[PDB]
Amino acid sequence: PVWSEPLYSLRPEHARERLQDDSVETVTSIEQAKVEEKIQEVFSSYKFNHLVPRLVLQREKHFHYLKRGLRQLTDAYECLDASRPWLCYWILHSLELLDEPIPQIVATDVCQFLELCQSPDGGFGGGPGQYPHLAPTYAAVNALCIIGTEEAYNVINREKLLQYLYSLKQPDGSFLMHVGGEVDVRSAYCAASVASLTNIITPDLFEGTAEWIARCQNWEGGIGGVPGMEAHGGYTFCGLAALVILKKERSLNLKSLLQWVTSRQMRFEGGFQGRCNKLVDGCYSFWQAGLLPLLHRALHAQGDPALSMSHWMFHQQALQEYILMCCQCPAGGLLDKPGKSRDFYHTCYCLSGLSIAQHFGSGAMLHDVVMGVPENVLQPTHPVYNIGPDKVIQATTHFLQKPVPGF
Amino acid sequence: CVFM
Amino acid sequence: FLSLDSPTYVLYRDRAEWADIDPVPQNDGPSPVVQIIYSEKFRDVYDYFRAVLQRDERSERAFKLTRDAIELNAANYTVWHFRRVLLRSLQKDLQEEMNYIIAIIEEQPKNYQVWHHRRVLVEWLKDPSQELEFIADILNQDAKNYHAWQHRQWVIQEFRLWDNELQYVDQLLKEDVRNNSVWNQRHFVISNTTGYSDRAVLEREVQYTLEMIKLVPHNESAWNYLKGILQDRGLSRYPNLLNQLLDLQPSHSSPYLIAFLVDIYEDMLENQCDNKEDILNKALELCEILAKEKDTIRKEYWRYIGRSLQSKHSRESDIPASV
Ligand SMILES: CC(C)=CCC/C(C)=C/CC/C(C)=C/COP(=O)(O)OP(=O)(O)O
Ligand SMILES: [Zn+2]
Numbered sequence A: 001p002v003w004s005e006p007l008y009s010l011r012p013e014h015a016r017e018r019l020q021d022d023s024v025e026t027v028t029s030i031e032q033a034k035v036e037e038k039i040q041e042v043f044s045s046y047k048f049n050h051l052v053p054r055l056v057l058q059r060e061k062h063f064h065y066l067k068r069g070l071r072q073l074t075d076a077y078e079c080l081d082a083s084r085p086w087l088c089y090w091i092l093h094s095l096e097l098l099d100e101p102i103p104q105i106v107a108t109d110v111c112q113f114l115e116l117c118q119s120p121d122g123g124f125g126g127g128p129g130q131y132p133h134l135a136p137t138y139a140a141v142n143a144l145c146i147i148g149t150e151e152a153y154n155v156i157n158r159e160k161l162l163q164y165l166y167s168l169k170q171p172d173g174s175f176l177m178h179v180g181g182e183v184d185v186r187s188a189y190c191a192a193s194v195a196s197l198t199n200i201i202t203p204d205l206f207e208g209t210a211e212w213i214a215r216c217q218n219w220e221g222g223i224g225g226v227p228g229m230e231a232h233g234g235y236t237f238c239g240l241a242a243l244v245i246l247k248k249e250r251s252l253n254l255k256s257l258l259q260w261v262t263s264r265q266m267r268f269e270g271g272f273q274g275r276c277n278k279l280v281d282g283c284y285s286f287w288q289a290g291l292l293p294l295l296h297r298a299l300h301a302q303g304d305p306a307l308s309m310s311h312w313m314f315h316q317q318a319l320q321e322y323i324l325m326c327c328q329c330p331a332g333g334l335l336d337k338p339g340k341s342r343d344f345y346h347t348c349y350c351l352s353g354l355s356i357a358q359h360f361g362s363g364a365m366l367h368d369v370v371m372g373v374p375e376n377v378l379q380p381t382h383p384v385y386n387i388g389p390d391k392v393i394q395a396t397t398h399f400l401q402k403p404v405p406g407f
Numbered sequence B: 001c002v003f004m
Numbered sequence C: 001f002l003s004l005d006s007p008t009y010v011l012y013r014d015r016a017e018w019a020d021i022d023p024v025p026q027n028d029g030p031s032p033v034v035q036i037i038y039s040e041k042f043r044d045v046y047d048y049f050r051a052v053l054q055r056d057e058r059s060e061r062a063f064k065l066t067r068d069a070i071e072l073n074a075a076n077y078t079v080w081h082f083r084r085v086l087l088r089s090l091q092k093d094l095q096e097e098m099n100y101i102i103a104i105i106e107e108q109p110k111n112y113q114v115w116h117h118r119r120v121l122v123e124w125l126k127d128p129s130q131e132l133e134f135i136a137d138i139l140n141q142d143a144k145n146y147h148a149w150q151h152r153q154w155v156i157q158e159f160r161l162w163d164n165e166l167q168y169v170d171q172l173l174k175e176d177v178r179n180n181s182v183w184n185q186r187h188f189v190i191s192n193t194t195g196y197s198d199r200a201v202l203e204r205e206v207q208y209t210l211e212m213i214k215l216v217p218h219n220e221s222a223w224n225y226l227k228g229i230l231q232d233r234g235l236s237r238y239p240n241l242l243n244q245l246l247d248l249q250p251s252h253s254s255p256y257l258i259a260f261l262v263d264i265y266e267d268m269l270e271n272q273c274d275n276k277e278d279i280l281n282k283a284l285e286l287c288e289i290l291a292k293e294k295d296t297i298r299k300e301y302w303r304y305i306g307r308s309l310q311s312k313h314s315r316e317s318d319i320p321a322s323v
Helices: A012-017 A027-049 A059-069 A075-080 A084-097 A104-117 A134-147 A150-155 A158-168 A185-197 A209-215 A233-245 A254-263 A291-301 A316-326 A344-358 A389-399 C040-054 C060-072 C077-089 C094-107 C112-125 C131-139 C146-159 C165-175 C180-192 C199-215 C220-230 C239-252 C255-270 C276-294 C296-313
Strands: A359-362 A365-368
Touching: A027 A316, A059 A084, A059 A344, A075 A084, A084 A104, A084 A134, A084 A344, A104 A134, A104 A150, A134 A150, A134 A158, A134 A185, A134 A389, A150 A389, A158 A185, A185 A209, A185 A233, A185 A389, A209 A233, A233 A254, A233 A291, A254 A291, A254 C296, A291 A359, A316 A344, A344 A359, C040 C060, C040 C077, C060 C077, C077 C112, C094 C112, C094 C131, C112 C146, C131 C146, C131 C165, C146 C180, C165 C180, C180 C220, C199 C220, C199 C239, C220 C255, C239 C255, C255 C276, C255 C296, C276 C296
Parallel strands: none
Antiparallel strands: A359 A365
16 A cells, blocks of 8 residues: 555564663663664665665675775775685675676686685685684685686685695594684584585594583573573674585574574564674674574475575565665665674675575575665575585585595 | 684 | 884884895785785884784794784784784793783783783683773773673683672673673573573573563563573473463553563464464464564565465365365
8 A cells, every 4th residue: 555664674563672671771772772872773764865766786886895895905905914815705705796707817816816815734814924714714625616617616615625624624523714713603604614615624633522512502592602601693604604515504403593593683673683692793793694594494494384485584575674774884885783794704704695685585485575676686695604605516516526535 | 704 | 112103103124123025015916916015114114014924923023023913904814823822932921911902902802812912811821810801991992892701701611700790790781781692691600500490490590581472562682581491391381371472462562562462372373282273373374464464574584484384274174185
């Protein structure tokens, strides 16, 4: 009808979703209220301006921001000088989602740059001459797979990579992030991701890893960084995704996990928070919402008959609304929340999350929801690797041609 | 948030 | 000696005591990608760091240089590793180093390297005496700092410093009963000390949680904790729970109270309760109220729960197709 508002966040009843602090103010409620007030202004902006809302993904703007950043960054990025392969990955993946081609000049330059970052003893460091570390190793491999050329694939020294992973493996099943470094669930996911993509998984490489990851699931249903710690979206994505790669999702109580992640979507804002009682943040559009495609596949693999055949178990529309209305920088790039400055990390994850929210896929069944203008639709992303599903297939197929190091 |  | 922010700070290339060393520029290749346009100060320190690292110069000057490299990018794990190599080779006083890491963490508390460095120091010294108080100071600035809580759990567990933690948890819960990190710490302390099997402890916990729930019915943390500690043994195993929750319905409702009721029914139906029929309907009704009115952001989840319950608890669920 004429009075009907198609945008969920703008409907009159949506106002009922505002925080109820029970007249007991604490730091948590105060902070939450500030965010909601700020976001309510964004929602109400169309109304106060007397304009018809139009949700447009600023592609040209995002593209310019990305294409330039792929070549040069201001000193604002000095804090990421030990994470350059991540800059390559975040940017290339964002471009891939936006369906922007990667010029062969660019692709070859990225390849050569990543080679310089590759350690003589396996793995990639944060920049040339830096010691190898699992986080930039994961990023570098993903970046090379997005490129997907023979050159890209050939950059990876598979034998040394496997040697590197073994040098980090711990007796309790976990992995250090780097030599003399910390241990947390990120390492399990980073190792499993690169080892699976490059076909270097030996029989004992991940021995005890699934169990170690399962010990990270806590009373909340989610997964913490290490056993005993608070459940967090970043670590939960890492844990579940690694378990999916190792085909051991069953080790987890998938039911409490599903209840936990679904509870992480903010009723008012529409985006996701990283942990209970904290604030909404656009990057969790991926870390948190990305868990739904994973859970759907896990539960479906167990023959769960009650699974929807057209939607993920989260409010796809509300997440898209949050991202499109609150997470776009006018000059290009995406962000955490209104008031935050853009960065390539949030650009990569807000877009990744948007793609997840727009596309439902379950074998033969396929259903899209594209809020706003049709041009808003992005290329799909693989829920485990967060690179194009085609890149995943292409890479795995290619590496399966090689024998697992050792033979 | 943080990541590494 | 010379702070990175000192008004009289001088670039390394202009320091006499460094004249013998040729700085090593970054090897970015002929046509760089993601090239960072570093400031003068940054590039100068790092060119000298690259030099000392490359020649593995384990010297006092190299040691002081790492402090600057760290202040420029505390996330540079390669610098932290070299610094730890220097601490051992140069036989540096580790308490002095503890003083240093305390200051660094105070200024950049959301960083993985600084907390890992402090941990290594504590391990080396086998001294946890300053930990709980240090962490408490950080938690006093950000009561939810993830690294702080994780380091705290490690110290407590490794050195068995359980004695006063529940008291600390109670203190923070009083300051902010919505602090999920504190509820998680509460569970950590209890499960590693008395455990929740002890009926007196469980009882105490549930009483406490229900009391917090009454004071702030919309605080999701108390709700998650209550479910967290009872769901293991099975919600149906506690008959009085349901009644008591229904009693809050009038003056303390929330999508949480309703969601919990569904969890209780769900388990009741799982442990073949009486009036299987009556229970299932009560549940599907709440699932609908949730997906349709009280908690629509989770409509896809609630619809799924409704279909799941129906799928295996309807009177027809056990009836053969031909009937
Ligand atoms: C592969 C890989 C490297 C994955 C990383 C995943 C990830 C995002 C982990 C987050 C870890 C963390 C300690 C967040 C808390 O920061 P915070 O307190 O600033 O944020 P918050 O308030 O949202 O919890
Ligand atoms: Zn974020």
